[PDB]
Amino acid sequence: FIPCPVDTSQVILPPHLEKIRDRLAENIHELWGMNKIELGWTFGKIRDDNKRQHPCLVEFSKLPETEKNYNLQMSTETLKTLLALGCHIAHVNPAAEEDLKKVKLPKNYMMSNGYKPAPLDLSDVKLLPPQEILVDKLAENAHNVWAKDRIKQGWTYGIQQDLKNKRNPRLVPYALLDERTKKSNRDSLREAVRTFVGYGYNIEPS
Ligand SMILES: Nc1ncnc2c1ncn2[C@@H]1O[C@H](COP(=O)(O)OP(=O)(O)OP(=O)(O)O)[C@@H](O)[C@H]1O
């Protein structure tokens, strides 16, 4: 397995998309905590897999920019993958950014940091069927990209994951992956294109 992702080598992000790139990476983390908290993770000085404790389970801006600019980066490439696939993104709708409301999580989510995630309630943002085919590409590119950095880091495939060694159970082509994760991946990137709409951006090629 060698992942061959889309060549974003020549795409350059325009400055008017800095806000939406920033404002998207802000929500990808709020979904991250929410999902971790739903699996039982808590806050800790450093990550503890045994205790299920994470240090980066803090407000987005408070993150270490080493582990924080990975959000902006992994999201910057998520916008630069759209321009490559033929789109152009334009902020056409002014009124969207005000009706935008964030989810009210139950109070048991607030932790030692007094921090409770607030994902966007993109409940009614139902993407047009053309925008669904787009997600399946991004949902697939996200795997080939994530696996591409793995092999350069040195990683290999194992029966189950060994955190110490380079062995992982999901360094396989997209065809071998499980339906649960394939949908899990596209569940997030569906919620990402929903964010461009939630702020009023048009995902239309000319
Ligand atoms: N350096 C890291 N920083 C933050 N999160 C990480 C890091 N490395 C791995 N993860 C998390 O690990 C997850 C992948 O783990 P995997 O899906 O194999 O098991 P899991 O879903 O964590 O299992 P469970 O949630 O039931 O314990 C990713 O969703 C990611 O959030």
UniProtKB/Swiss-Prot annotation:
Superkingdom of origin organism: Eukaryota
Tissue specificity: Brain, skeletal muscle, placenta and possibly liver and kidney. In brain, highest levels are found in the cerebellum, hippocampus, caudate nucleus and amygdala, with lower levels in the corpus callosum, substantia nigra and thalamus.
Sequence repeats: 1-105, 106-206
Cell compartments where the protein resides: Sarcoplasmic reticulum membrane
Domain notes: The calcium release channel activity resides in the C-terminal region while the remaining part of the protein resides in the cytoplasm.
Function: Cytosolic calcium-activated calcium channel that mediates the release of Ca(2+) from the sarcoplasmic reticulum into the cytoplasm in muscle and thereby plays a role in triggering muscle contraction. May regulate Ca(2+) release by other calcium channels. Calcium channel that mediates Ca(2+)-induced Ca(2+) release from the endoplasmic reticulum in non-muscle cells. Contributes to cellular calcium ion homeostasis. Plays a role in cellular calcium signaling.
Self-association and partners: Homotetramer. Heterotetramer with RYR2. Interacts with CALM. Interacts with FKBP1A. Interacts with SELENON.
Family statement: Belongs to the ryanodine receptor (TC 1.A.3.1) family. RYR3 subfamily.
Disorder association: Congenital myopathy 20: An autosomal recessive neuromuscular disorder characterized by variable manifestations. Some patients have congenital limb or distal contractures manifesting soon after birth, while others develop muscle weakness with difficulty running and climbing stairs in early childhood. Additional features may include facial dysmorphism, and delayed development with intellectual disability. Skeletal muscle biopsy may show variation in fiber size with type 1 fiber predominance and atrophy, hypertrophic type 2 fibers, and abundant nemaline bodies.
UniProt protein name: Ryanodine receptor 3
Organism: Homo sapiens (Human)
Full protein segment contained here: 849 to 1054 of 4870
